[PDB]
Symmetry: C4
């Protein structure tokens, strides 16, 4: 169980990092368009 818990928590953090980076990229595409 603990292994699957670690996997789930890292997966969540990856998705959070991705969403935050794409948020800043869209602010840049929004600035230019």
């Amino acid at each position: 169980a603990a292994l699957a818990q670690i996997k789930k928590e890292i997966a969540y953090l990856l998705a959070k990092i991705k969403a935050e980076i794409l948020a800043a990229l869209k602010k840049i595409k929004q600035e230019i368009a």
Copy 2:
């Protein structure tokens, strides 16, 4: 085995995050070029 399974699945998620970020970056380089 479960450890290698966790590693393989995180590796996959990393590659997915990378491809998605580079997809949005190319939409931005495409907009400007």
Copy 3:
């Protein structure tokens, strides 16, 4: 304990990768603004 230690260290590295990428993005938004 070692499992939680691995999780904590990967979490730290993710946050470092995110901060560095957002640093370069802001240098780009700064260039254009």
Copy 4:
């Protein structure tokens, strides 16, 4: 040992994802400058 091996390999993949993303960002900052 296997746990530390998994950690080392994910760490490597993170650094590879970061370097590749910053490579594409610099191609974009290079295009505009």
